[PDB]
Motif scaffolding. Structure first.
Motif, mmCIF file in Angstrom:
data_model
loop_
_atom_site.group_PDB
_atom_site.id
_atom_site.type_symbol
_atom_site.label_atom_id
_atom_site.label_comp_id
_atom_site.label_asym_id
_atom_site.label_seq_id
_atom_site.Cartn_x
_atom_site.Cartn_y
_atom_site.Cartn_z
ATOM 1 N N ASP A 41 0.878 -1.169 0.000
ATOM 2 C CA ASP A 41 0.000 0.000 0.000
ATOM 3 C C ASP A 41 0.916 1.220 0.000
ATOM 4 O O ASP A 41 1.577 1.505 1.007
ATOM 5 N N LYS A 85 3.308 0.723 3.141
ATOM 6 C CA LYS A 85 3.072 -0.413 4.020
ATOM 7 C C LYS A 85 3.216 -1.683 3.205
ATOM 8 O O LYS A 85 2.691 -1.789 2.091
ATOM 9 N N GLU A 107 -7.685 1.288 -3.341
ATOM 10 C CA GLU A 107 -7.196 1.438 -1.975
ATOM 11 C C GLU A 107 -8.293 1.220 -0.949
ATOM 12 O O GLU A 107 -8.010 0.769 0.164
#
Ligand SMILES: Nc1ncnc2c1ncn2[C@@H]1O[C@H](COP(=O)(O)OP(=O)(O)NP(=O)(O)O)[C@@H](O)[C@H]1O
Ligand SMILES: Nc1ncnc2c1ncn2[C@@H]1O[C@H](COP(=O)(O)OP(=O)(O)NP(=O)(O)O)[C@@H](O)[C@H]1O
Ligand SMILES: C[C@H](c1ccc(CC(=O)N2CCN(c3ccc(C#N)nn3)CC2)cc1)C(F)(F)F
Ligand SMILES: C[C@H](c1ccc(CC(=O)N2CCN(c3ccc(C#N)nn3)CC2)cc1)C(F)(F)F
Ligand SMILES: [Mg+2]
Ligand SMILES: [Mg+2]
Lengths: 352, 352
Positions: A7, A14, A121
């Protein structure tokens, strides 16, 4: 190939990494050297370079994923350092989400034959959140709340069951804030967002105090008195505003006492850090409260890394949501709060 | 006694004064000297002392009030200077609202035989707003909007009819923000509020730029580029976030580019002033939007002195409310926007 999900946010990358622990003798033979180097590098270090960190306390041990047993690791580093990450990679199927999956798509493709699969996302957030709660945090609850959040001598972290998690309001506090309404595993929407998020806290705090890190900003805030900068209801009324149930201690105007030059000359950096934290946190809770009322949802879960190592904001949210909702809304928190998008991306691997 | 209404806010005192213009020859004889001194002082000066101002352009001429004809005057000064005001008064029935009617009650009572009647600040706001619109602004509309607010070559102030003004969402931007839902002349409620108001703009701007007045803060903001401080959607995604209809120009994180030391070293005071204005204004509009959706009200009127001589914030509200509402909400503005509480207080005079 190693099993990763990534991410790439506006501030932090991350990474979720599945380390297989059921490797057979024959599999170890067929395991190519570069791949053994990566697994040993990731599992034998907790700091990577100067800015990468493995959050060892979050590791899920002996997880069964895609028919294999392994450990799920959680790793983070600043998006500013993604060029270093890609350059080391240049020295494989990557499922990636966040804005950076799009912004840096061409950079990931400098890794020869790399297959980049961009995933949404907020799809990845919902899928990762539901997955981690489902598997548990090594047998402990992934979700918690603060019991008796209005009484400091009683207030304490306690587990919360999300076995039937719908409906759920998810408040993703990253650089900014996104507010999601989750009605089922396949029915969710982005209700709205706000621009006053973790990046506002860190950016304003750095301008006002000269702090050089998130952790330093929080340490300053822990020592400060936000009421030196904020104008309270009692500063305007002399007490409570009884007619509308506003207590004298409520903030009427964030930074509102800073219109006076003599007050600006006496306020400390710590006071300003705490006022910045309180201003941002109360605004997030208030927007969450309004969205929950409109969506007719009473469980509000807060995620994103604004709240990592940030008990002050968590307890302020827990108290404020309960108080201003007259007990109708409950603030919920998750142990893996910053990593759900990265997990959801990893979970997209079988589709490719 | 002279006919006054006073709204003592956290930052500004607003005073409405009715000047009779139908004084007969016999009334002028019976008019005591101190009272003639006050009327001549108020009507022959536009600046009072060093900080009082009469907003001459707002005067309502030849108004019939309480059976007399007169001119209605609008006067303001900082609440910090109320001790000077009371001291001159010490050198009569006062209807007063705002928090300062309570906070400074004992100070007003130092004026011998003065009768202070405290009235509720949101009761007075609604009554004054409805009254001024009803009598008109010297035959012109009191209420206006910005037509074609999304197209700068078309955008222009235009009158708006409020003859049947219910329901109405009223957003009072003072030191903080109060949001009211008005369903009838006697049925209104305070929906919620936010602490991010005019005092936040002025206080943060003063901390960040060293400006010493509201007007200076606005002048700085007029020259600045908020995108030097703010992180936009396109800074995170490289473009639009198409899935959720977020344009690349939308602010993702207010002050979010200030987490980078090199950006903090290049940003100008004017950029910071404009980012502060944009941050506060967008948050107010967003909270207003959420409250309007929940209250099922499509007309949103913005009042309070955050918007005085502040066309930037007014046009930002007009554009943002229309854009983010997909045209379902309309931003409305009023010519007498800071004075409605003071007028509503004056209108309470017959009850005493
Ligand atoms: N080590 C850290 N470095 C920077 N910010 C941190 C750190 N730890 C916590 N934070 C906070 O966490 C926020 C970023 O949270 P995060 O959920 O990772 O956002 P992001 O995904 O990078 N941004 P976005 O693109 O808006 O989703 C920052 O704005 C800080 O408030
Ligand atoms: N001359 C000025 N001096 C100070 N602030 C000004 C001035 N002109 C405009 N403002 C702005 O107007 C705001 C105050 O608006 P106003 O509606 O008068 O609030 P108030 O009634 O004093 N506060 P409150 O008690 O919260 O209702 C300030 O926060 C500034 O943003
Ligand atoms: C009357 C006026 C005024 C008073 C107070 C306020 C601020 C306000 O109304 N509130 C209510 C909602 N509140 C929160 C906070 C957290 C959560 C959660 N989670 N929810 N709500 C923020 C403060 C504005 C104007 C003034 F004259 F006194 F200035
Ligand atoms: C996805 C994520 C992100 C993007 C954008 C935002 C901010 C946001 O969603 N909005 C919508 C609502 N908006 C307003 C503004 C004015 C009015 C009125 N009047 N109404 N709404 C403010 C901005 C947060 C997070 C990031 F990865 F790109 F960072
Ligand atoms: Mg993110
Ligand atoms: Mg006021």
């Amino acid at each position: 190939s190693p099993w990763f999900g990534m991410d790439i946010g506006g501030t932090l990358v991350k990474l979720s990494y599945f380390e297989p622990i059921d490797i057979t003798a024959e599999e170890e033979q067929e395991e190519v050297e570069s791949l053994k180097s990566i697994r040993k590098y990731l599992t034998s270090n907790v700091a990577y370079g100067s800015t990468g960190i493995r959050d060892v306390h979050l590791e899920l041990k002996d997880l069964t994923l895609f028919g294999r047993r392994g450990n799920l690791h959680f790793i983070r580093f600043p998006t500013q350092d993604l060029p270093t990450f890609i350059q080391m990679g240049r020295d494989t199927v990557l499922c990636a989400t966040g804005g950076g999956a799009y912004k840096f798509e061409k950079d990931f493709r400098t890794i020869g034959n790399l297959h980049l699969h961009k995933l949404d996302e907020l799809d990845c957030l919902v899928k990762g959140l539901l997955y981690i709660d489902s598997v548990s945090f090594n047998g402990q609850a992934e979700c918690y709340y603060f019991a008796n959040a209005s009484e400091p001598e009683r207030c304490q972290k306690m587990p919360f069951n999300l076995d039937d998690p719908y409906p759920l309001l998810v408040v993703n506090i990253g650089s900014g804030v996104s507010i999601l309404a989750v009605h089922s595993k396949d029915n969710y929407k982005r209700v709205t967002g706000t621009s006053l998020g973790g990046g506002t806290f860190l950016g304003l705090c750095s301008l006002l105090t000269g702090c050089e890190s998130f952790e330093e900003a929080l340490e300053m805030a822990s020592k400060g008195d936000s009421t030196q900068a904020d104008k309270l209801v009692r500063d305007i009324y002399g007490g409570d505003y009884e007619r509308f149930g506003l207590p004298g201690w409520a903030v009427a105007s964030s930074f509102g006492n800073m219109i006076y030059k003599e007050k600006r000359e006496s306020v400390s950096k710590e006071d300003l850090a705490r006022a910045t934290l309180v201003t941002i946190t109360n605004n997030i809770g208030s927007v969450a409260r309004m969205c929950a009322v409109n969506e007719k949802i009473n469980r509000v879960v807060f995620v994103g890394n604004f709240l990592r190592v940030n008990t002050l904001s968590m307890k302020l949210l827990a108290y404020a949501l309960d108080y201003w909702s007259k007990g109708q809304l409950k603030a919920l928190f998750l142990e893996h709060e910053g990593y759900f998008g990265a997990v959801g991306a990893l979970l997209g691997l079988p589709n490719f």
